[PDB]
Amino acid sequence: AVDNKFNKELQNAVYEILHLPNLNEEQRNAFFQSLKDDPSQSANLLAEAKKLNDAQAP
Amino acid sequence: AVDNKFNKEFSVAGREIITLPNLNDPQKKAFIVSLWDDPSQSANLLAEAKKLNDAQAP
């Protein structure tokens, strides 16, 4: 029974999603909720947030 | 049981911390780790981060 906490991936994804300039507050909150619920998906969720950020570029 | 959700406090304090212009990268990352881990302490963490920012003004 390995204990995976996903510290590296989760902490990076939280920090990077806070940093993405083009997301609105509700979108950020949705990502944070997904991260809190399933840290194993942190890399996919960060990738999805980056795509959304880019699609909302000015 | 009461469910204290700190989604808004996290995003708001987190955005304020990550935008303080005089904090360095590891400082911001450390604050965000502490905030994610205990979001009930958002007010204290933001206050500490703001003081640090102001002590590092150019």
Numbering used by the authors:
A (entry chain A), B (entry chain B): 0 to 57
What does the paper say about this structure?
We adopted the Z domain of staphylococcal protein A and its affibody binder dimer complex as a model system. We next generated libraries at the interface of a weakly associating dimer (Z+ ZSPA-1) with micromolar affinity to determine if we could affinity-mature the interface by coevolution. To clarify these inter-residue co-variations discovered from the sequence data, we determined crystal structures of 10 coevolved pairs that spanned a range of cross-reactivities and orthogonalities (5 from LL1 and 5 from LL2). From the structures, we could verify clear compensatory changes between the residues showing the most significant covariations (13A-9B / 17A-31B) in both LL1 and LL2 library mutants.
The second library, LL2, used a more diverse codon set encoding mixed amino acids (F, I, L, V, H, K, N, Q, Y, D, and E) for four randomized positions on each of the Z domain and the affibody, so that the functional diversity (1.91 × 109) of the yeast library almost reached the theoretical nucleotide diversity (4.29 × 109). The highest affinity mutant from each library achieved approximately three-log enhanced affinity, KD of 1.99 nM for LL1.c1 (LIFFK/FILF) and 1.86 nM for LL2.c3 (LVLF/FIIV) compared to the original dimer (KD = 2.92 μM). For example, A-LILFK has more Z-B binding partners (B=77) than A-LIFFK (B=15) from the LL1 library, and A-LVLF (B=53) and A-VFLV (B=42) are also more cross-reactive than A-IVFF (B=3) from LL2 library sequence data. Binding of VFLV/IVVY and LVLF/FIIV are highly enthalpically favored and entropically disfavored, but by the end of the trajectory we see a more moderate enthalpy of binding coupled with a moderately disfavored entropy in IVFF/FILV. Although we could not observe any structural features that distinguish cross-reactive versus selective complexes, the thermodynamic properties of cross-reactive mutants (A-VFLV and A-LVLF) and specific mutant (A-IVFF) differed. We do not observe systematic differences in the structural parameters of the interfaces mediating specific (A-LIFFK in LL1 and A-IVFF in LL2) versus cross-reactive (A-LILFK in LL1 and A-VFLV, A-LVLF in LL2) complexes.
